[PDB]
Structure 1
Amino acid sequence: ATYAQTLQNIPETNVTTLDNGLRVASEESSQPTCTVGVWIGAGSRYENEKNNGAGYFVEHLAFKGTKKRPCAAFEKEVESMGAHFNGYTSREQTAFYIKALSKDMPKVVELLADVVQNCALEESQIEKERGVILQELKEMDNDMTNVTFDYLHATAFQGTALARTVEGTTENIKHLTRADLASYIDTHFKAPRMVLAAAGGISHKELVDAARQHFSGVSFTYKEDAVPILPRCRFTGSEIRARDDALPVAHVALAVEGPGWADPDNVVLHVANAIIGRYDRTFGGGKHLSSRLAALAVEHKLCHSFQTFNTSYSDTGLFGFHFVADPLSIDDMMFCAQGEWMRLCTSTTESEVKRAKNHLRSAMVAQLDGTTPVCETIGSHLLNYGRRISLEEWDSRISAVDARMVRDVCSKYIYDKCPALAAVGPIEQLLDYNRIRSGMYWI
């Protein structure tokens, strides 16, 4: 029963829209258990300077209870049905979802609706979470990788909204008002911008009837039905070096502006990132690993790890790589890294893309390893790509990619481009933007 076929067999993802704008979608499996959630098209990018951190503060309350069912009432009801509720909030995408028995499919939707709509926002709890978020910041600040990507955005998108952290400023957390969290919810958590997605043993029809029932938003004026278009974020070849010779290792991330969800090149970009891949000191492969960079990394003890990435966004994106190294091998590593990038633009081989494509498909499949991940793909696809994109399609697109294509596309986005750099730790060895800028050409 060849791969090809198993692909065209996976049940189609159904989507139906309500009069309020809400879009309900789902992929039905025989699974006795399931996952359902609302993927809102909101994040820190929608926040401005005065409320940076709202969507995150709000994330901390969508679970402390609603108007109808207060704290214990909510938790008790949810804990007692063996369900798992949890979510997240990115720069331009927020999500809240539950993992429950396909049986409870309809009661969950009710619960979801009650959260996005009737958050209690108990002004008593607010002051508590305020101290919690402040505490999580102290912690997240010790996560070099995070510090490094935030900074990456901080300078690559300096001057724009995309250059803000999701968690927000220490001041905003200390001062946001119930009212602020209030309007945040009112302004963003809106039907035409939300997506009720589900995966598992669930009837799409049953799913949508339940949606109609509690997700009964009303829309009178045109304004309400409209989805705002965010102001464009300006990428800037720049660098931010936060140095502290006291930290054990050093983090380095370099990137170029990426196209954005909609753009087909992304496929090619992924196939490329698939060649250089990623590495880490516990990869059994060793000196024989296929990725030259990885291989080089191993042969020269160049880094405790490295990883490529193609972080997409609506209108923009970040295509780069990140590596952790010892103070004294930062240069050799950076050198080799740009080396492979230049190689991508100038000499990618068919054999490489062949391996890359296979590896990619495999990752593509792992993206749908369970109701939750599958669900996450739906919520995001609709939200980002507008519709759903089947593995059969992705797989198609991927197959079209070839060396020539990789080189052209990579040259297009990499060659002779002013990159964005972020470095943290004992970064004295790696140095000079110029020296790095010249690494952008010839290979």
Structure 2
Amino acid sequence: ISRYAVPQISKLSNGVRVATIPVIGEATTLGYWIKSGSMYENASNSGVSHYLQHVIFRGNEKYPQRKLEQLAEYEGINLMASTSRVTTNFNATISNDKLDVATDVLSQLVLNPRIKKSIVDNERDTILAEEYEVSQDINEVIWDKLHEISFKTSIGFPILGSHQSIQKITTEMVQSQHSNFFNQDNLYFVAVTSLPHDVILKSVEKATQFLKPLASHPKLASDNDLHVQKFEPNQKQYLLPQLGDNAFVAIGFEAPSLDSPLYIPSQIVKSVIGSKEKYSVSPLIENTNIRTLNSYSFPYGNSGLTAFFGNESINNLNGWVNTIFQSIGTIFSNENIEGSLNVGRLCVKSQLARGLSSTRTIADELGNNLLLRNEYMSLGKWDELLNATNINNIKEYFDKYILEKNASMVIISGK
């Protein structure tokens, strides 16, 4: 657990910023958080951000693939990476003693790769495999289809890329993306730890002694305004007979940008509809027997998407949609707005205070916060804003974003 804390940031003279937030315990999650992802790609390079992520973890100069495997098994250094539409990270969660080895492996691979035509080509099949796997989670499929028809712009690309695109990725492209996106000025070193801010700063200094400062700062290729998104609501239906007597359905609306006064309101609204689990469904859902429901709302640069999805039998499909539309409606009703605000607010508090005793979770928010925000936002000061959120705020969100808007919709059916 943390304590409504605030991070300490020092910049090394080579321009790497070390950001640490104080934690309790013998746990430490640490790594590189990079503003690189599919939002920043075009038709010609789609998937390169994810592709590069993979290559990075396939060894460089000082730590090739074999030396990495030994470190996994024998040395207790286990390396995780992920590429979203908006960010990339490479991290390890460790025992406080492995600090020096870990900062070195992580800096070496992220900031000092050796991107060969051989590593690139070998890796291709391992990525196409990931693509086919993920194509069999229809939740992932529908999530992607919804983005694709909502956004003619880059947010509609799948993170991995189209099959076509995963095919045509050159070494020059992978190289280029590292050159333009993996520099000191487009990233943070993040540690969630009990060790003082200086033990991490000294250790990173050691790990990145090979890295020379940046000469100049050409406008960052990750800058939101180079990748303006346009939401346009669309409807599109697909077949997948293999599914049988099942259909999957997604409903989407444009969402506020991260910095919008209506961001929180939107998060409260999404949350009050929320998810259906075994024992738990929203009070706004009239038909509690609906098979499954998921709700997400994510910011993407100037834009964002709020999405509601589930599967049902062909027979119950149309019903599911009316259920969801009804539930959304009910929130705006004067008889229910106040209760919808409180329950939604509780949810958001619940969600966050649930990832405060995992240091992987703390690091991921700290990374994203620093990479994505005008300036940093703390749990406690977030909680103030959540509690200050009123009935008028919810209404104002409903006005710009829900009331009289066409929805994006995707159906994937067995008929």
SS in 1 for 2:325: helix
8 Å CA contact 2:39–2:227 kept in 1: the answer is no
Residue-by-residue CA offset, 1:54-89 (whole Å, 9 max, x unaligned)? 122222222221112211112213432212101110
Spell out the pairing of 1:214-293 with structure 2 (5 A cutoff).
Answer: 214-215=207-208, 216-223=211-218, 228=223, 229-248=225-244, 249-280=246-277, 283-285=278-280, 289-293=281-285
Q: 1:387 to 1:107 in 2, by over 3 A?
A: farther
Q: In the alignment, what sits opposite 1:306?
A: 293
1:366 aligned to 2:344?
no
**CA distance in structure 2 between the aligned counterparts of 1:79 and 1:122, rounded to whole angstroms:** 26
1:318-357 matches, within 5 Å, as 318-347=305-334, 348-357=336-345
Shift of residue 224, structure 1, vs aligned partner: 6.8
Deviation at 1:318, TM superposition (A): 0.2
For the 8 Å contact 2:100–2:207, the answer to whether it is kept is no
Q: Residues 217, 262 of structure 1: CA spacing in aligned structure 2 closer, same or farther, 3 A cutoff?
A: farther
Matched, 1:177 2:167: no
C-alpha separation between the residues in 1 aligned to 2:156 and 2:292? Answer: 25
Question: Share of identical aligned residues, percent?
Answer: 21
Asked whether 1:419 is paired with 2:414, we answer: no
Alignment of 1:34-433 (within 5 A): 34-158=28-152, 160-215=153-208, 216-223=211-218, 228=223, 229-248=225-244, 249-280=246-277, 283-285=278-280, 289-293=281-285, 296-298=286-288, 301-302=289-290, 304-347=291-334, 348-426=336-414
* CA drift at 1:16: 2.3
Indicate how the Cα distance of structure 1 residues 316 and 23 shifts in structure 2: closer, same or farther if over 3 A, else same: farther
TM superposition shift of 1:340: 1.5
Q: Residues 290 and 166 from structure 1, CA distance in 2 versus in 1: closer, same or farther, beyond 3 angstroms?
A: closer
CA RMSD of aligned residues (A): 2.1
Task: Report if the CA contact (8 A) 1:37-1:197 is conserved.
Answer: yes
Q: 1:414 to 1:69 in 2, by over 3 A?
A: same
Which residue identity is paired with 1:405? N
Q: Specify every segment of 5 or more residues in structure 2 that has no aligned partner in the other structure, as ranges.
A: none
Cα offset, 1:402, TM superposition: 2.7
Q: Structure 1 225/154 Cα, relative in aligned 2: closer, same or farther at 3 Å?
A: closer
Separation of aligned partners in 2, 1:123 and 1:390: 43
Is residue 253–residue 407 contact of structure 2 (8 Å, CA) maintained in 1?
yes
Q: Which residue of 2 aligns with 1:25?
A: 19
Q: TM-score, normalised by structure 1?
A: 0.87
* Number of aligned positions between the proteins: 410
Give deviations 1:375-414, integer Å, cap 9, x for gaps. Answer: 1110010011243322211111111123332223123210
Farther-moved stretch of structure 1 (38-47 vs 402-411): 402-411
Q: Normalising by the residue count of structure 2, what TM-score does the alignment of the two structures yield?
A: 0.92
User: What's the counterpart of residue 11 of structure 1?
Assistant: 5
Change (3 A) 1:352 1:211: same
User: How far is 1:245 from its partner?
Assistant: 3.9
CA shift digits 1:136-161 (9 cap, x unpaired):
22221111111111111101002x11
